Each structure stands twice: as C-alpha cells, then as structure tokens.
C-alpha cells in the first residue's frame, strides 16, 4: 500500500511520468524524483526544478559517456564534465535549456560536437551491469530506462520540503506521490524483479 | 524607485542579506539571488535553493580559487572542478551542507584538503579586476564582497517563477523583492559606483 509493483512502474515511465524512487522500504530514506531522460519536457523539467535541490543529473550508462566524450570531472556519484546541446539554447539554465540538453544526452543520434562543455546539465556515468553492481540511484536510473525499452539515459533530482528545504523523508515522499499522482518504488524493489 | 543605491546595498549585504542583481535597467534582464558566501545559513541557502534554478554557485576570485586547488572544470562561466566540504556534510547536497561548504569556500582558514571533489557547488572563478574587466554576475558577486569589506567570495543563483520555472525578468524581480524585503541592484550602477 506504499510502493508501485514494478511492471505498473515501468508502463508509466514509459510514458514519460516521473516515479518517486526511495533506496529500500526505509521510512528514513530521502526520495528522488526520475523520469526517462529522452521524454523530459521544458514543463517536467520546471516541475523537477520547482519541487528538488535543482541540482539536476542525467545518469547514462559508461559507455554512452564514453560515447558523448563525457569524461569524469576528475580521474560515489561518478559526475562527468558538465554540458549543454548547443543548439536551441541561450543560458543553458531554463527548464526549456535542461530539458533540450537532457533529451540530446539521450538522444543516439547527439554527436560530442553537439554538446558545449562545461554547461548545466550534470551527466552521471552508471556502471556495467547496473542495479546488479551498484545500488545507486544513478543506476537505478539507466535501469528503468532500459527496463521500458528505452535509450539507457535518465534524469534524476532530490525531493525537497517548500517549509524549511529538508529533503523529502519517506512520509513526505508518499504525501507528494498522492498530491501529484506520481509512484513510488524503491531500488531493493527493482533489484528483486530483475533478479531470480 | 526601482533600484537601491549602492551604498545602502552594501549595508544589506554586509549585513548578511541577499541582493536581487540585474544586469542594467533593461525590464527584460532576469535576475539573480546574489549574497555574501561567508554569511550563507541553513535557512539562507534553502531559501536561495527554494526560489532560483538550484543551479547554486560560488563566485571567487581566480587567486582564491587557485589557493584552495580548485582548477577550472575544463582547460563563459568559468566554472571550477565541483566540491563538497569534508567536515560536516553527509550527502553534499542538503541546504545545510551547500551552506557550509559554501561558508567554508569563503574561509580563509580553509585547506585544500578540506574539501571533497568532484561535490555538490559550483565555485565560478572571478577574473582580475572584476567589474572592470568583465561585467559578469560572478565578477558582480566578488566585488560586492570586496566592498562590503568581507571576504571575496559570493553565492548566486538565477530566480525562477513559481508559475512555469520561467526566469524571473525585471518585473517579477521587483515583485519579489517587494514580497521577501530584498533589495535590487544592477550591475551598470555598480560600475559607476567603482568608477570615476
């Protein structure tokens, strides 16, 4: 009576909804928000922003990275160098721009000459073999993509209180899901359906 | 009737309050939180977080920068590799940790081994002269610093509309500072103050 079977999960998702992801059944978890990154509109990105830290990642998976020429910022959440789609953006901060930029990341046809580097957008490289190797939101992620048939790229932001800025707890996660119609799984949840 | 002096500006922002930055008097220039980074709390920083992109930034000057190894990201915001500080944060992310590591970025005491990289703020490097040599709202948020007799360093972040996650232009900059008793500033005011 809290958390979204999966398959229902994966159907919505599919079709461009966000899902609240928690890490387990915790009620102490903090939530995140995710959705697919190639269906992200300037209107989901303004919600994504509006309702989280802002702080707005596009998980791919490593070799889609490699791919984009996304390099690891340096040489934990494995940031690349930032980056905005160079065309149809201006300050690369709009929802208009994020959403533009997050769709592009997703998109296989993006070339790395598509992408001005830094940017706005913080993609972040998933590991091989996903949710099995690494219980990250990140994979968590690429997982649901590829779970709902689409590219392995997803966009992710952490729940927030309008109160007092406190991330979102599991209660005030249920309390948004309800208020917006959005689902709530949790990443044991999803590595116990794709494993057995 | 619109902008506050320069003067009285500064007694806000030494005093710990965020200015509404434009870039001059045009009513299509959107504007940005800026505040003193040393001064940043908890509460400041949900605030900036709850209202703006999230996007949240950390001007300070190249010198500065340099001192606490925090080299360009890549090698035009001049955005630096992204960090959290060590001490007192868990996820990087919360209000209260982007707040200490912002404070702490302004430290003077702070090591470069303080801090974790790659994290959760972006410090921006201010070039030389700041406002007189390029008239960037990263340039803006040190010299406000400098001359409000703090150390060099800022917090910025672009105002979004509650409505659509669209930037607030000069109207709604005025409404909103109107609402929350903010003060609004340019940057070509601020030019002719440092000039003469």
């Given at each position: 009576n809290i958390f979204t079977p999966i398959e229902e999960a994966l159907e919505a998702y599919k079709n461009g909804e966000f899902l609240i992801v928690?890490?387990?059944?915790?009620?102490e978890n903090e939530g995140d928000l995710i959705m697919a990154a190639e269906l992200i509109t300037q209107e989901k990105m303004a919600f994504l922003v509006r309702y989280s830290s802002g702080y707005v990642c596009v998980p791919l998976s490593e070799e889609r990275a490699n791919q984009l020429e996304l390099?690891?910022?340096?040489?934990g959440t494995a940031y690349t160098i930032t980056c905005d789609f160079?065309?149809?953006?201006?300050?690369?901060?709009?929802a208009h721009d994020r959403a533009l930029t997050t769709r592009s990341l997703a998109?296989?046809?993006?070339?790395?000459?598509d992408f001005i580097k830094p940017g706005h957008i913080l993609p972040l490289r998933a590991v091989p073999g996903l949710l099995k190797k690494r219980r990250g939101h990140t994979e968590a992620a690429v997982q649901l993509s590829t779970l709902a048939g689409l590219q392995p790229a997803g966009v992710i932001c952490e729940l927030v209180r309008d109160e007092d800025g406190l991330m979102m707890r599991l209660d005030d996660c249920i309390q948004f899901g309800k208020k917006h119609g959005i689902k709530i799984i949790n990443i044991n949840q999803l590595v116990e359906y794709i494993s057995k």
């Open positions: 928690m890490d387990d059944e915790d009620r390099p690891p910022m340096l040489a160079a065309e149809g953006t201006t300050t690369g901060i709009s998109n296989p046809n993006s070339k790395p000459q």
